[PDB]
Design an enzyme around this catalytic site. Structure first.
Site, PDB file in Angstrom:
ATOM      1  N   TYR B 158      71.042 -59.480  -9.640  1.00 29.68           N
ATOM      2  CA  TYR B 158      71.536 -59.833 -10.965  1.00 29.68           C
ATOM      3  C   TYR B 158      73.017 -60.117 -11.052  1.00 29.68           C
ATOM      4  O   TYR B 158      73.517 -60.508 -12.108  1.00 29.68           O
ATOM      5  CB  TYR B 158      71.210 -58.747 -11.990  1.00 29.68           C
ATOM      6  CG  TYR B 158      69.749 -58.673 -12.349  1.00 29.68           C
ATOM      7  CD1 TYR B 158      68.798 -58.411 -11.370  1.00 29.68           C
ATOM      8  CD2 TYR B 158      69.308 -58.893 -13.658  1.00 29.68           C
ATOM      9  CE1 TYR B 158      67.453 -58.374 -11.668  1.00 29.68           C
ATOM     10  CE2 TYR B 158      67.951 -58.856 -13.971  1.00 29.68           C
ATOM     11  CZ  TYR B 158      67.031 -58.598 -12.968  1.00 29.68           C
ATOM     12  OH  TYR B 158      65.682 -58.568 -13.232  1.00 29.68           O
ATOM     13  N   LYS B 225      62.923 -50.781  -1.369  1.00 22.96           N
ATOM     14  CA  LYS B 225      62.190 -51.525  -0.356  1.00 22.96           C
ATOM     15  C   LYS B 225      63.065 -51.458   0.904  1.00 22.96           C
ATOM     16  O   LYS B 225      63.347 -52.470   1.550  1.00 22.96           O
ATOM     17  CB  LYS B 225      61.972 -52.979  -0.808  1.00 22.96           C
ATOM     18  CG  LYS B 225      60.969 -53.746   0.048  1.00 22.96           C
ATOM     19  CD  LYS B 225      59.619 -53.052   0.041  1.00 22.96           C
ATOM     20  CE  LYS B 225      58.684 -53.574   1.130  1.00 22.96           C
ATOM     21  NZ  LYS B 225      58.260 -54.964   0.889  1.00 22.96           N
ATOM     22  N   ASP B 279      56.514 -51.411  -3.168  1.00 23.60           N
ATOM     23  CA  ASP B 279      55.109 -51.824  -3.221  1.00 23.60           C
ATOM     24  C   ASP B 279      54.219 -50.640  -3.544  1.00 23.60           C
ATOM     25  O   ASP B 279      53.315 -50.729  -4.372  1.00 23.60           O
ATOM     26  CB  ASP B 279      54.683 -52.409  -1.877  1.00 23.60           C
ATOM     27  CG  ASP B 279      55.802 -53.154  -1.193  1.00 23.60           C
ATOM     28  OD1 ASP B 279      56.327 -54.117  -1.789  1.00 23.60           O
ATOM     29  OD2 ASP B 279      56.166 -52.770  -0.065  1.00 23.60           O
ATOM     30  N   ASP B 303      63.554 -53.428 -13.160  1.00 31.11           N
ATOM     31  CA  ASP B 303      63.075 -54.380 -14.151  1.00 31.11           C
ATOM     32  C   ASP B 303      61.580 -54.557 -13.998  1.00 31.11           C
ATOM     33  O   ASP B 303      60.850 -54.602 -14.987  1.00 31.11           O
ATOM     34  CB  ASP B 303      63.754 -55.741 -13.962  1.00 31.11           C
ATOM     35  CG  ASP B 303      63.298 -56.763 -14.984  1.00 31.11           C
ATOM     36  OD1 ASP B 303      63.560 -56.551 -16.189  1.00 31.11           O
ATOM     37  OD2 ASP B 303      62.673 -57.772 -14.590  1.00 31.11           O
TER      38      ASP B 303
END
Lengths: 429, 423
Positions: B158, B225, B279, B303
């Site tokens: 972002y 992740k 995930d 988000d």
């Protein structure tokens, strides 16, 4: 099984699948490589072979049959060949063009499931394909039965390219210095730095395969998942490039949402595939809210990973998740799940994922559509009759779960006694 | 419209942040913005529902002095500029504020005005609580979804650091990478940069932990992740754990410690701090909602996980949230201006309301207000008295125009056995 090149020798009675022009040529006695793999791999792989053979024999009256050719990777290659991934294995797959593999164990000290990555990279299997279907099993999604999708994920770029450096590395400090002096961009001195690349070339070839899959399976909607409003030149470009290749090479078979409302009465022109797009966060919310509005989903590496995993959770099929990595005229199928060591060799593991991976390899990539149909039927039948392995018997109080071998035998009985008349209703060729 | 044209309304004793803790009076000034689009309506409903709730739970020994400010279309018509310098420092002074969804400023240099706002006041923490209010939901376990997402909202993807594939800037970084780092990027590829700093991670995690301690949460899960992005997401996770053990040692335990120093069960007096690959996390809020409470994550992951959880509980339209900085916070709904409903008295105002509740009841400590605000909303749902957005999913139920629904909540707040609503 072969350890070296000279030892490579397709078994007796089979002919190699061929790739001429832009099409795959599949003989009726196709050689298909298979890798047992690690952990539960051997067990589920041997289950898949039996189930598929019975399927093949049943729907084609014996005129067709697969000639399985064993190749080694993982613990069996270390034991026989002295190495985890012999060159002969990669050359063998490239020769056969089609292979089924079980999960592989990741070498200590290497990047995640590096063996799978090494195989994918060596063969340029850029497209990761994950179908998500409901087989009647208990699911947390009230609309599980309305989830019938397939995720086409670009599997070579994005943050998965591995371009990144530690916050305290000299490289990072150099990059931060370059960014400020050349672009007046400020990044904290204590920040790790990663680079995200997305190319026109990788996006187009991925979108093309996706569109071809849609035509092959009669899908009526192809959705581009991206976060283009935030990452304009990577994810936004991905969306843009995917739309372009669609109109450029599939113009007569596609219609965008714009064209639907604009050029048409806001209605779907029959025979045309709707190509639309959804911002990733919204996409996540929509497969949960209106799963019936989505079929084929096209996405860059990361979003593809997240969306397919979430979808599998909704239909209660995390452990049954099938997958396949495809390149040009070449493909390797494998389940999403890992080696599951705690179940390895206990005849307890659910072989469905590996079975469905085979079904994906033979029924879709190779075109033997009827095989896929009879296999999914047998599985849905087993689930309804509550003849399943322990993982699925979790929400089935009172049910005596089946061992892997017994579940295999159960699916084969449904396949043999199946009434093809209806099971194969509107699917053939 | 300007710095000098605005001043705290009569009776308001401005909320003040000093030392290491906030301090609010019983007649504090809480800035607010009608925003635009369906904003005005929703903000309106939020105002009345709050006061009503405020007078009911405190008898009348407390009241809020709503101090209006401008932004969006109702600032372009009176100030000439979308986001006036006043509206900003008017918030920096109030320390707390509520706002509706502002309109995307076409032609400006910002993605949205919310960005300029958060960047101006340094509201680095995006907080999105997700709860189920009994409405029709797609998740069989919607009722077991009760979490709050702490999302780092200043870095990651972002930060907007990227370049078009064919830009000369892209070519320069492309050649710079291949030459000095042996890294080759395709000439036809867009390039984005993803930064994750120790500084930003730490303060977000600290805010999450204090929130857990303050609200009695027993699980704080780090979503990352790191197996793919080791130096950004992986570092993010390592730094989160690091500040947890460094400044909250006595109040926390890791899953590893739970196994080795306990019978594999979390000590009741300690907060479990664990992590989940992104995930796995997405799958887990679907399969085991009840095992997660507070979720900490980088910008993108935060988000995604908050958006997914909201869809599960059928609360996409009523998702509330707030951005918080050091001693200051601005609350608002996640949804947008939705112009197709502007001034038509139809849009569900629950989100805006739940945002105020999150601001007043949580950020400002007035817990009683939150308790009764949620009680009323849940009562409305368990009574088919809701706006069209939810009614469309209820057979026969008639859509109670925003106004009607607003009155209903207040009506439920007035007549309530406070002695039981609280426990």
């Amino acid at each position: 099984p072969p350890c070296t090149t000279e030892e490579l020798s397709p078994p007796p009675g089979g002919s190699l699948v061929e790739y001429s022009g832009g099409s795959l040529r599949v003989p009726d006695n196709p050689v298909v490589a298979f890798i047992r793999g690690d952990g539960v791999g051997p067990e589920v792989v041997e289950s898949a072979l039996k189930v598929v053979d019975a399927a093949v024999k049943k729907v084609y009256g014996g005129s067709r049959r697969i000639v399985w050719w064993e190749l080694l990777a993982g613990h069996l290659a270390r034991e026989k060949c002295g190495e985890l991934l012999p060159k002969a294995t990669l050359e063998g797959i490239r020769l056969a063009r089609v292979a089924l593999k079980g999960p592989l164990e990741t070498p200590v000290g290497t990047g995640y499931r590096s063996l799978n990555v090494a195989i994918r990279q060596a063969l340029d299997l850029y497209a990761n394909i994950r179908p998500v279907r409901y087989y009647g099993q208990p699911a947390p999604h009230k609309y599980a039965d309305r989830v019938d999708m397939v995720i086409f994920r670009e599997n070579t770029e994005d943050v998965y390219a591995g371009i990144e450096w530690p916050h305290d590395s000299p490289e990072a400090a150099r990059i931060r210095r370059f960014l400020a002096e050349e672009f007046g961009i400020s990044i904290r001195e204590d920040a790790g730095i990663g680079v995200k690349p997305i190319s026109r070339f990788a996006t187009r070839r991925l979108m093309e395969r996706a569109l071809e899959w849609a035509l092959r399976n009669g899908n009526t909607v192809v959705t581009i998942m991206h976060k283009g409003n935030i990452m304009k030149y990577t994810e936004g470009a991905f969306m843009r490039w995917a739309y372009e290749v669609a109109l450029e090479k599939f113009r007569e078979h596609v219609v965008t949402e714009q064209e639907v409302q604009e050029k048409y009465g806001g209605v779907r022109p029959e025979g045309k595939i709707l190509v639309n797009d959804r911002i990733a966060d919204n996409m996540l919310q929509q497969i949960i809210t209106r799963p019936w509005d989505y079929q084929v989903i096209v996405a860059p590496n990361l979003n593809g990973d997240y969306i397919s995993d979430a979808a599998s959770a909704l239909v209660g099929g995390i452990g049954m998740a099938a997958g396949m990595n495809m390149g040009d005229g070449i493909a390797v199928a494998e389940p999403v799940h890992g080696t599951a060591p705690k179940y390895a060799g206990k005849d307890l593991i659910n072989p469905s994922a590996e079975i469905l991976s085979a079904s994906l390899l033979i029924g879709e990539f190779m075109g033997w559509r009827e095989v896929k149909s009879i296999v999914e039927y047998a599985i849905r039948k087993a689930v309804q009759s509550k003849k399943v392995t322990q993982d699925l018997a979790r929400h089935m109080p009172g049910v005596q779960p089946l061992r892997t071998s017994e579940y295999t035998e159960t699916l084969i009985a449904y396949i043999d006694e199946a009434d093809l008349n209806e099971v194969l209703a509107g699917k053939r060729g």
